[model samples]
Target: SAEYKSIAYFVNWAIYGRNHNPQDIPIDKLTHILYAFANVRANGEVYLSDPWSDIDKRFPGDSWSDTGNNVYGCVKQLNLLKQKNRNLKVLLSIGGWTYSSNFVTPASTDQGRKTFASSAVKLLADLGFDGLDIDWEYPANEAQATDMVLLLREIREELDEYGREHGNGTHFLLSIATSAGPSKYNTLHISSMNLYLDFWNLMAYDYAGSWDATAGHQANLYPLRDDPVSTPFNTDQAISAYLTAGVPAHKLILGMPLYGRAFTNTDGPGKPFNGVGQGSWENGVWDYKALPPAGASVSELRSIGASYSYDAGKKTMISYDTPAVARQKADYIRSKGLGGAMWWETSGDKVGVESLISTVVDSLGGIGALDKSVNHLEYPESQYDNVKKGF
Candidate 1:
């Protein structure tokens, strides 16, 4: 069974950075975008990021907060869109690269976790959010692990409590964004995964990049001829590591990056292995819209020196550059009978880049294959009345 509903992504500072305008992508156009993806099956789920955490020092005070308010407006527009299209579920992602640091402090202690969970529930209630997604970078072995689990448990408990209190059938979904490397997983408690998490979004991208100062595939599915590590290095290996650690197969969601990393080919002759490469797009990244037609499919990109290496021992593909490889990865998800697939961002792709998403959905026999088909709008009397007042 397909565990993923569709491709999802984040839209944060971009909306409030002053560099871009929210009106640039009007709500109607946004609605059409969702509508366009409505029946693609693979493109059924859309994850929207709303930065509610305190703004970083770089942005100074209140910039992100103000932006967060704008995000709320965007959320309202999305909610209205959902009313018209019952198949779509728009989730608010709470943290990202910079914003996740706060998760550490609040999740570290029992009191903090309770306060955090309460705040989360109230935030969802006030915002009319569907659920909460915890993106605490690396926990457990890392500094935040102890608090991370506590926080997740608290959020789960509170969500259940809220559900029972108002007799609301709603369940605030809980998910965590996890690391792909073995180092992080080694410290994480796999047994605790399914206990509080509805699903795990495995960030399977960024296996290699320009920072390495060598010509290597940024997100290869399989091992490349030029890779320095002789041992298996690919997506299959990554996923296998998770399973080896005891994570449930059904709750795992494989990640696919809409953007591709690039390196500048420097002259250092070793089968192009030692050549220095920079990010492909310099200041920008390789999103679906920006990729050439040939680069669109995983297999096609794999053939063009793009890596999607698969380790037979590991049983996972490592390709992150082509649509064919993506399709193959999605097939692997189905073959293994794992959960589903997830993407970094919707904005990365052009209108039709979702074809890959459709392909996955079609392979899985269309939309709602893995969805629970619950009506979130059906809340308890007290909450429903409160929700109406907010509207």
Candidate 2:
């Protein structure tokens, strides 16, 4: 059921640092927001990513300590919310795009794997986390692939051991964030995964960007343009690639980005739609909220003299401009029978707008049964009222 499914987002220092003092959104208010969102829908799981940890050295000042909050505080708040609603599951996500560099080295050796696993378990236990999620950017090669599998194995072993010692029936759930590209798929050890992982998150977005020499959908539903074998990149293709590689459909959770990439207009020299190879994740596109209204639909692109295409093979609809394309990409997420959709970050959209997260929940039949709990309405309002109160 979609209710059993969940919609999770990444909330880091990026959001909190911008508005109100760092202490304003107190723990209570944070819980209130979660409860409010949880009440509107039955979101069963919430995974907070890159919460302060000594594990990796990616974002120096972006750790939990930098935010004046710690993982323990966040977990406590989540558990408090959970106590009222038993079905809610909170997992701590370790590693991210910037912090993933150490994943290879730590998981490569037995001692390193053990150390990593132990730290994960201890952190989970100390904070009362229900599980842990590993978001190692990519492991396309043999060495990293082997290390990735072993890391999962070690974490599973330790989680099992921890459950026995505590005698609380608390088993840590394990999940991994994987790449969507075919090249990365071939390197994984599928058989070694069945016993260790709870699920695999397949990032289906970011297929095309200004980084390429031609215009294409960042995430399409099916391959529609160019060569049938390689040109179009869509959701079905990404999922099929993983399934063919041995991952079951049920264990796969498709990814949906909250933000979209964009490129500048370069008359006709570089490539159609502003030189295909000139853009990048760092500079290509603007977010959906910032896109102008006329750019909201692909049909409007022509009036603006922009070139747009829908790859029939990929089943994705893209516009030359950013607005229409991002909306079309999100619609594609629902059109396909994906497990659930995940976004990059929570702070990317306007505060009250029906941002990507809200759009997904509403599209998925208005939040499932799991999110319809009465306790969600009981959160105190005072906690979130002031933006300066520390958690």
Q: Give the number of the best model, judged by lDDT.
A: 1
lDDT of 2 by residue, 252-301 (tens): 76565545554334222123455332222345544444433232333333
Candidate 1 deviant stretches above 4 angstroms: 1-4, 14-72, 140-143, 224-233, 266-284, 293-320, 368-372, 378-391
Tens digit of lDDT per residue, candidate 1, span 153-217? 88899888887774354666777778877777767776666589877878877765544543344
Model 1 RMSD in Å is 9.3
Model 1 poorest 10 in a row by lDDT: 35-44
Model 1, position 92, has a per-residue lDDT of: 50
- Consecutive 10-residue window with the lowest summed lDDT within model 2: 35-44
Model 1 residue 313 distance off true place after TM-score fit, in angstroms: 37
Error of 1 at 25 (Å): 10
Estimate TM-scores for all models.
Answer: 0.73, 0.68
